Design a protein around this ligand. Structure first.
Ligand SMILES: [Zn+2]
Ligand SMILES: [Zn+2]
Lengths: 310, 153, 310, 153, 310, 310
């Protein structure tokens, strides 16, 4: 039975280079020759304790493309949740007696991990947990990178924005640090720098990384430009405004980029990427968003199906 | 062992003796590891004259032996301690606190948004030494804190 | 065509001993040999005018296990519902022209009954109505009792907690008073006693019941220990605290219980049952929650299917 | 009370010895009353054998004396404990725990709505015995509870 | 100096028979001859952590009728929690440095008592601390009973409504219990009966009391009829309706009442006192609210002035 | 006429060394000999567009201690927007026709400044305009430093906490920078450091300052320890916890502090100053809040009176 069969998908760190490649290989196949009844008769719980429409819609669409049923809920906006009542341990203990798999998104770090200890034999997939993990978004970022660059080794990857609190850039850095020869360029405001811990891990591997203050400063040599959303709340509106101009991508900034270079963004973009970029062949965030479907179909197929016949 | 002073001294038949516990740590260990929850005769000695090392705490648990794993749990609180096995009134065995791999249910994740706090789960941290400083990574939120920070609680 | 075919499931009182047994027999079968396309092509409306996730998820999972489709809604949090507008009579008149069955949960007593008068030929199942009925929860409690005790006659059943306002203990008492020789033990705080009316009905049948102040007081002789949630709002926090200690189950209190004795709770437990009980073989609330699925699949199969072929 | 003249614990020259503490309460007493936050020699014996009650706890604090009030505070936990004041290897005087009129800091108000729960204030309860039990009245919320409930778990 | 000078008024249990007579003697003199400038130059903080428009308006009118200035605030919240942090202790430690007295209402029991521990030399006056005390409402009631009956001893007092929860009847019973020969008739449904701790104190002090089924049985004897509101939320709508009628007062019931008989009510009355009662000479609930002005001026005059030249 | 007569108090940058000494000399005299009727007949508007109970209560107590009347309002809102329309300009143009002075707090920077453009001859006093200024809190602090140290020059001042965002430390540093020989120790985590614009001004003016890792390194030298609250929201919960300990003050740290050393804090303190500090003679945060009463009376007395006979 496949390596991922019945496993829980909690943190990217629990996945080896071999696992990532297995998911990505399956995703490409599901994209080529679709299997609409593969999961027929399964019932999956879409448990969004934290609301997220883009992510819920994508996971659920994934569930539907494979023939599975979906039960679930979203935004548990309890008026001042001092105690929503039931413990999460209890909720999972109950839900795991109804369904065949649980996809959950929760506000607190470690929630999907805890769930794992009460779901019994039912696999639980992490759809986001606090400021910790969001593995499905990474599987989608890597699949989009491999699809467009043809490889996950020897790439010049730039990560721009809120490198400090962006849970996704943290994960992408760890996943790609599992492949060889990748060079990282970190473009972030002084107050939102890549955490030391990530730099530390990188150095151990003997991976190269450099810190840049401007994007055009490294424009010419990047294959992937991964922009993230700088949240103004993390900043003062004056200081925000003071640094803004330094990290917003406009089509002009791309005039020196390579033919193969693509711009990714977990979305939503808003200030950071001008619409004029949408029209260039380097824009790949919407295509990246579509690949979530195959990355997600793949993951579910592998976990819920003894052997993938493709 | 027996603090043979002048008049009298006590001794257990066979069991464990934890000696060289730094002062003020003795009671914590009894509390934390819930060692006082047995029907066994326990003898505790607090603020004992060590002279050289200073003042020490001492614990003797009768007809009770600690697995190497249990002895290892003392590392962060009393790494200097010596755990003696006594059988037939004498020290058949002697081991010391070795740095564990994981530290269960005795610590508290300083991450306030960690799921561990409000739930029916034992905490668990992964011990990682980085030359004397010990980083402890939470099993749940996966954050890594200094042992200093976690230990204050 | 089966006795329950096309009938409405409004109150437990409308079901005879023969009906209860028919549902329970069907549930056991659906649990053994599943029928995933039995309801294929039906569309069921999940109408939760009052939100309830555990119940909605369970009913919907039930709908999915039998191949049916589901349309519906939940928590109609109208800002101060002096008048939500349309009458319930009108809503059901409209919804009954789209679907094949309506499962509804409403805040006011008698809502499912009213619906019945406007759904035309469409069956309506009561998923909870005010402080009146909640028949599906009972069918699930009885199925769990029969499954674990092997019978619904001659049992020593204890009901603990808010016996006064607990709509479920009221229903379980009536259902079991349809079988013979059951002895009831009522453990409740003075301010939350079993309503006189229930005692009255019991006496007419010539059924035995005794009132106890402590659980361990009857521990040794019960087969079923049915705990309910004592809601603090119904009480003063001091008086709550004053009685609390008297009605919370800990594993210790079970040391004298019988091998066959099981602890049920409609859930959510919170204060009342300590987690240490979860680990004992007497804990059966989560298993009881799983049986809701078969009790619910059964009910829907019987109502929507001319004859059950099993 | 218990007299072993063979494997016996070493006696104290001067101090306080709390004897007859019922088993499993001795540790609570150390915790509750912060008896270990001292530099003096403390010797604790747990689950000690005494046919008089089977297993008892015992605590000896050196060069330390408990006042009448302080002793009275043990009244809820070890009501039959004997507090023998020691000097020069002889019991210079005993003491029995008397139920006091007020109890501070150690108890917690059962009342969930009591303000004493979220504030920088030391709990205080008025003690009044009434057949079968002892009632405790909170200084703050003024609600009266049975000791049995105040002393919950 | 007078006995109440610079003293905190926290609980009725803290004041004596004399203290009570002293407050009521002063109230009477101020009602007769007002002192519009006794507290001039004094600033008083009306701190309503729990909003209570009726109580605040009255307290503040009282402050203004003596010439004092008022700064304060009404309520503090969110939905089912609040905000971040700052202890009641620091709040009182700060405010204590600006004002000359603190009047305060709070949702938690013991809040006023705790304030006296941080207010220094500033007297703290309790306008209501959760289900615990409400000193000034009892003084206002007592002043009304004395004003209309001519005495506080040897009265026939009937209390009606929700005796289990009414913090005003518990307190009034305790205040009246400090005087002689009073007799109490308690008329409440079975679920809302006078708690046993009050009954015990009455017994202990040799005070006569008795339970009655309806106001009718005892109308002729009663001098004071004290009513309270039975909130429907303390009962299930069905339950409420059955008892209701037993504790609702109409002008027609006053039929055989003594000349001096007065009907009192803390207010809001809603269903309990029919409007046709307002026209009888027995209705005194509005005149009781007006007296709150003088019982309150009395306290402030006594606590802030070392001597009263009244 | 005095120099501050009929002047607006908007920013600390608008007042001079003299102006500061003039406000503090008056504050001292009013604290010594109160003038309860200096502002009688004057009506002042306490306009809190942004609620701040602590600041409002103090400002209004100040107005009342001088005999002025107060009309005003606290907060204005919706959830994340507000209402319809009416400029701050028209609001001030209207209110300016009723009252004699305007005290106002507002969420946007520059709001108080704009008011002076529409208030005519009515002086506008800033109680806080977003992250910009808060003049009266700095005057209250300065009055507290002077009152306890005997001077505003040649002091050793240590500032602790969130220096990046604290609008009170930026302002205090600017005020103290108008005096001579002061030395500043800035003790903050790396993410919340004193902005460079402040550091630049210090440099430009030849003023000595230095960064320190912990209060310990410099306790012995410091005359004034000014603390601020590091809001957990400015950090990720994990981040917070790691730094936290470095900037939390206990009574035990005060161990080697000078006799004259005072600990100040704008408040609310929460975790930053342990309660055991309140018992040392060094704790002066509560006495600092009380002085706000006199720095505020001082301003109003000076702005509304052409001459003070103090
Ligand atoms: Zn954690
Ligand atoms: Zn209390």
């Amino acid at each position: 039975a496949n390596p991922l069969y019945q496993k829980h998908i909690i943190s990217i760190n629990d996945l080896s280079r071999d696992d990532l490649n297995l998911v990505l290989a399956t995703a490409a196949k599901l994209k080529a020759n679709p299997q609409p009844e593969l999961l027929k008769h399964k019932v999956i719980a879409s448990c969004f304790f934290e609301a997220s429409t883009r992510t819920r819609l994508s996971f659920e669409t994934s569930m539907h493309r494979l023939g599975a049923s979906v039960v679930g809920f979203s935004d548990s906006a309890n008026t001042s949740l001092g105690k929503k009542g039931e413990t999460l341990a209890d909720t999972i203990s109950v839900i795991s007696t109804y369904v065949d798999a649980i996809v959950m998104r929760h506000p607190q770090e470690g929630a999907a991990r805890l769930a794992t200890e009460f779901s019994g034999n039912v696999p639980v997939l992490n759809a986001g947990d606090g400021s910790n993990q969001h593995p499905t978004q990474t599987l989608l970022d890597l699949f989009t990178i491999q699809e467009t660059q043809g490889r996950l080794d020897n790439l010049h990857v730039a990560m721009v924005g809120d490198l400090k609190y962006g849970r996704t850039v943290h994960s992408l850095t760890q996943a790609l640090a599992k492949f060889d020869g990748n060079r990282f360029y970190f473009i972030a405001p002084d107050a939102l720098a890549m955490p030391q811990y990530i730099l530390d891990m990188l150095d151990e591997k003997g991976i190269a990384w450099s810190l840049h203050s401007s994007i055009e400063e490294v424009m010419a040599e990047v294959d992937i430009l991964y922009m993230t959303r700088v949240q103004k709340e993390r900043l003062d509106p004056s200081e925000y405004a003071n640094v803004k101009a330094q990290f917003v991508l406009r089509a002009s900034d791309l005039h020196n980029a390579k033919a193969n270079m693509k711009v990714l963004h977990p979305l939503p973009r808003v200030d950071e990427i001008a619409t004029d970029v949408d029209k260039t062949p380097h824009a790949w965030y919407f295509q990246q968003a579509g690949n979530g479907i195959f990355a997600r179909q793949a993951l579910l197929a592998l976990v819920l199906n003894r052997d993938l016949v493709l | 062992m027996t603090h043979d002073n002048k008049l009298q001294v006590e001794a257990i038949k066979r069991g464990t003796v934890i000696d060289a516990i730094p002062a003020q740590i003795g009671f914590k260990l009894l509390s934390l590891f819930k060692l006082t929850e047995t029907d066994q005769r326990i003898t505790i000695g607090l603020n004992l004259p060590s002279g050289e090392m200073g003042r020490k705490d001492l614990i003797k648990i009768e007809n009770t032996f600690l697995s190497e794993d249990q002895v290892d749990q003392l590392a962060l609180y009393a790494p200097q301690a010596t755990v003696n096995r006594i059988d037939n009134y004498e020290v058949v065995g002697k081991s010391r606190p070795s740095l564990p791999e994981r530290i269960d249910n005795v610590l508290v994740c300083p991450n306030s948004n960690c799921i561990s706090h409000a739930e029916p789960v034992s905490s668990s941290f992964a011990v990682r030494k980085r030359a004397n400083d010990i980083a402890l990574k939470c099993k749940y939120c996966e954050k890594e804190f200094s042992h200093n920070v976690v230990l204050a609680n």
